[PDB]
């Protein structure tokens, strides 16, 4: 879908002579609460030996963006189990919310790698506070002072079949 960030805690089961296991929090990006829970179990099995039957979710909670007015610079770390052996990747994305940055990431990754949601594993999204930690060039482009530029040859969306004017692309 269009994405929603989710807190997910899950704690194993209690057993006899094991009161209060540790709890384990994750920040999942997913469409809905059902998928975030299934995502959460898939992460947990890699880190240590668990399963869905052996444990339980404590508290699924949505996390909204703190300041979804302000335009931020993000820097997402990703890795993905393909093709061949896996490897990391660092892209910088300029976007208003975190959930919007991860949306624009998954569309960029689906183009360039022929790779799905299930393949790709997000490590950690980070807001970059100060500029000139921005190492990438295409994001550093827009941070220049008094930025002006024209619309990119404005294409005109055609409503009608027949038009009398000889349309001027304007400009």
């Amino acid at each position: 879908a269009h994405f929603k960030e989710y807190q997910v805690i899950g704690r194993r089961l209690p057993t006899e002579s094991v009161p209060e296991p540790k709890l384990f929090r994750m920040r999942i990006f997913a469409s809905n609460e059902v998928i975030a829970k299934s995502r959460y179990w898939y992460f947990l099995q890699k880190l240590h030996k668990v399963k869905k039957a052996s444990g339980e979710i404590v508290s699924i909670n949505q996390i909204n963006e703190a300041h979804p007015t302000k335009v931020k610079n993000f820097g997402v770390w990703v890795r993905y189990d393909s093709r061949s052996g896996t490897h990391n990747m660092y892209k910088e994305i300029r976007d208003v919310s975190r959930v919007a940055a991860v949306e624009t990431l998954y569309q960029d990754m689906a183009a360039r790698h022929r790779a799905r949601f299930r393949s790709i594993h997000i490590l950690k999204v980070a807001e970059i506070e100060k500029t000139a930690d921005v190492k990438r060039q295409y994001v550093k482009q827009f941070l220049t002072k008094d930025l002006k530029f024209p619309l990119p040859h404005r294409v005109q969306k055609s409503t009608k079949t027949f038009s009398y004017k000889r349309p001027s692309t304007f400009y």
Binding site: A126, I128, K135, R136
Partner: peptide
């Protein structure tokens, strides 16, 4: 190629500082 790299070594050090001690004592 990263901004905030040098935190995460200290995070992994500080996280492992527990897993040294809390196993033993």
């Amino acid at each position: 190629n990263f901004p905030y790299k040098a935190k995460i070594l200290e995070e992994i050090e500080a996280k492992k500082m527990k897993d040294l001690e809390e196993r033993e004592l």
